[model samples]
Target: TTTQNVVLTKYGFDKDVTAIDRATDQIWTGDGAKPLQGVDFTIYNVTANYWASPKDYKGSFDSAPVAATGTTNDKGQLTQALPIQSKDASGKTRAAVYLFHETNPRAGYNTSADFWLTLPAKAAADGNVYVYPKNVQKTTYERTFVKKDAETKEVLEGAGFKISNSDGKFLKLTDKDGQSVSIGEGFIDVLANNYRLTWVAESDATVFTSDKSGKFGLNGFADNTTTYTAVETNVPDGYDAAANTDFKADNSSSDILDAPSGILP
Candidate 1:
């Protein structure tokens, strides 16, 4: 979780409070604010969760039974192809997909999360990567929504998209064939009391924001820490949840449960 060559940029990592922010302002007056022309890109900690089933995470804050973590260079990118063995009502190991970093922001309209940063799409040639979430158990979600944007539908769609909430879940825009030309994830914020959604283009995979209110019980939150493991509550044409790494959860519960003290007895 150490980023030496990469620039510290505008955000600082807080152990007690993990809040990711957009670089909309510059308020650095401390040593952590040193200029970084010498640095190439920023380094960030990324964690991936592997779950047995959505039921394992039901009515609880625990996520992907286990989390495999790493670090991303300034390019803001790193990918891991998962070895999945899921079957339909029958039984079969369909195809293999990737469970990547969801670092997009938490906006009212965004229906997804992206691994933050404005780097190239692929990993660096030299492959500068780091492993994070250093520890693991059945508890603790490495990826959590801390912050996001609030924009209008006209502003969101006019920019080439549409985002809304349905029954407390994120709804995305599709093509004329009702296909999801965009890719993204969504989460509910208890602390902010909002539904933040993030979307991305399948072509280049940039980030976009929107509103999530058509859903049910998504606006009745106040405190943070309630993490949601997004299940494929709804995935339309051209898009396949089975083709992507995704999940969903109803975070109407506490984030503290099934946690063990660090000290050994």
Candidate 2:
């Protein structure tokens, strides 16, 4: 028999968290940090006494579990006592190959990439294993703008804007032929988004507009390092487009832009 401990965490925010470091084993919230909780895990024994790549597994596995399923506690911890020796097809005891998968992910969190482990060929007294599974999460953020007279704090409507990267190209939603690109399962396709310039009579009516404040949320970015810029593409009938406000999304938080004082004579 062998006992093992497992811990889960995300990248960028929790590089120091590991299964052996109990004090630093925490979930990366992308802003601050939090403890991982209620994530379920299942341990399976490869009945074939052989191992296959996840892509070559043919989506089939044995029906028996190697150990009792586990769930992460508030501190992102799971403990399991797995049996090492199991009867094979010939009815002879052999080393067991185990697979671990997250059966249930935390609320608002996506499932982690597939992972597994194998027990030692021979079991000895006080056998212990430590597994560290570093996983990532899906996070969403936004960018906002308010058009108005530079000197006045009044909010204006009927303004058009285009959000792009530093290169000035529109945040692409598709390829050259307007076909969406596949980013694989559990991965984010940054180009599959609508962040182009458009005119709206009311900021509240804008797509993804949840509040009265003139805002646009381009949620579900894979990481926090992407750079985005907003520039006015068009202005109201009495406003000067040349005086439009612009700003860059330098971080994961929202960026707010306000028009400067100017009028089209």
Candidate 3:
């Protein structure tokens, strides 16, 4: 019997690729970065006449699968074989086009772009065909902030803010639990910094409030391709918002927008 081999390799943001079985690969859920598992791949037969955009040809291919859909296994690999072969009009061997797409992507990871592959007209010496498809996934990062009073060095509450970046807009923020934290018209919450934490004194304790540590933060930044600026729009009831309150955070694992420090008048 003739067979066509299909191999699926999972790639990471670091460009690392790991082969997994499509039948039963289960990726681990942990803090350490790793290739995504449990990704679903759907295969379709395609006509040579299909459109040319390698990344956008999802529904343009044949409706029926050349083979049943496959998914990645815990090892980040999907190895399967199809019992089909390509043939020319005269019943001779011919190259065939196949479109493979990521039907279901892991949560928090970007969807795999749809792609196409061609199968050799003739089988290998072993009477089989082999095709390798590589896919990658990226995990989102978190950006956080801790508002504080500059003078007394106390965490501030109820400070409203407007966040923007050189790229021009703000993505929604989330809590430590990954649930969306409503910007609520740009107002920082009273419990924004509701965690006990400590920080180092920035050079002159009275001049700059830098190099501080805190447990509270705002999560859910897709990525830090852009530097963000947080402007204080409203101060907590009984406190004066800092004047030079423009702050930004980077793509680091975590970042804090330490307000210049609010003043209690």
Candidate 4:
């Protein structure tokens, strides 16, 4: 089968959260039992919402219901059927699958994982959280909510290119060669997403091996969407070149550079 080309990158946010530090002041190293305050966080729900992109994924939308609808089982007991739903770019709808895990940590602390389940929080509607196309490195996947570029003196151009973090409420577009660009509010209609590194089998035969088995099948990458491309040189304003990945949820900090003509590109 062809190698999966999806990519997912994790980005950090500007928020600094306080965490408990279990380290003690031993051997004159540091402080004792105190709060290891920081923004470092772990996954609360190891599982993710791996669904088709807005409307690009080729997975099944309506299969057998995972949960039975509310129906009396001879005894006439009130029952409820909770199902996961997904929406696409064109506003299409479909059912989805979920993945659950055991114990999971969050906010630098070992939190409970009893609530971990692979299901959408609510039915597919205006705003729904989804998962990534595949798992991604928790350290690399990122999300960003960028504001439209202000009037500046810079130029940008590109046919296709991607940035560090594209899974967010909005992304500031620029050319591949690093040019200034602008996106008005509500220009890009992408949603927040969760990302992780997905490991797959290795392709090279003689590079590395396990037990004389040649290349090991443990390769992986950021499993994010692939439709977005970096802008080629000279990507002027009023240009779009990408789409969000299938999974939904969804951080990143960036700066404005490449300004010219004292105006927006």
- Report per-prediction Cα RMSD to one decimal: 24.7, 10.9, 11.8, 22.3
Backbone clash count, each prediction separately: 37, 3, 12, 57
The 10-residue segment of model 3 with minimum total lDDT is 202-211
> Which one wins on TM-score?
3
* Model 1 lDDT on a 0 to 1 scale: 0.26
Q: Candidate 1: misplaced stretches above 4 Å?
A: 1-63, 84-92, 96-265
Candidate 3 TM-score, C-alpha based: 0.42
Q: What is the per-residue lDDT of model 2 for residues 79-122, given as tens digits with 9 covering 90 to 100? A: 66666666555666666666777776653355665555455522
Q: Indicate the residue-level lDDT of 217 in model 1.
A: 20
When 3 and 4 are scored with TM-score, the better candidate is: 3
Summing lDDT over every window of 10 consecutive residues in candidate 1, give the lowest-scoring window: 131-140
Candidates in order, TM-scores: namely 0.17, 0.40, 0.42, 0.19
- Decreasing TM-score order of the candidates: 3, 2, 4, 1
Instruction: Give a tens-digit lDDT track for model 3, residues 1-265.
Output: 3656656655444435444422212222222335455667877766333333435645566543355587777655676675445543344454555677787665454566666655543444554443334444454444455666655666555455555555544433333333433333222231222111111222211111122332233433445564555545555555555553333334233323334534568
Q: Which residues of candidate 3, in runs, are more than 4 Å off?
A: 1-9, 13-33, 37-44, 47-97, 101-144, 157-160, 166-168, 173-227, 233-235, 243-265
- Candidate 4 matches the true fold with a TM-score of 0.19
Q: Estimate the TM-score for candidate 2.
A: 0.40
RMSD (CA, angstroms), candidate 3: 11.8
lDDT of 4 by residue, 129-233 (tens): 321111111322333222222344222222222222234222233222234333222212111111112122222111111111111111112233432212222
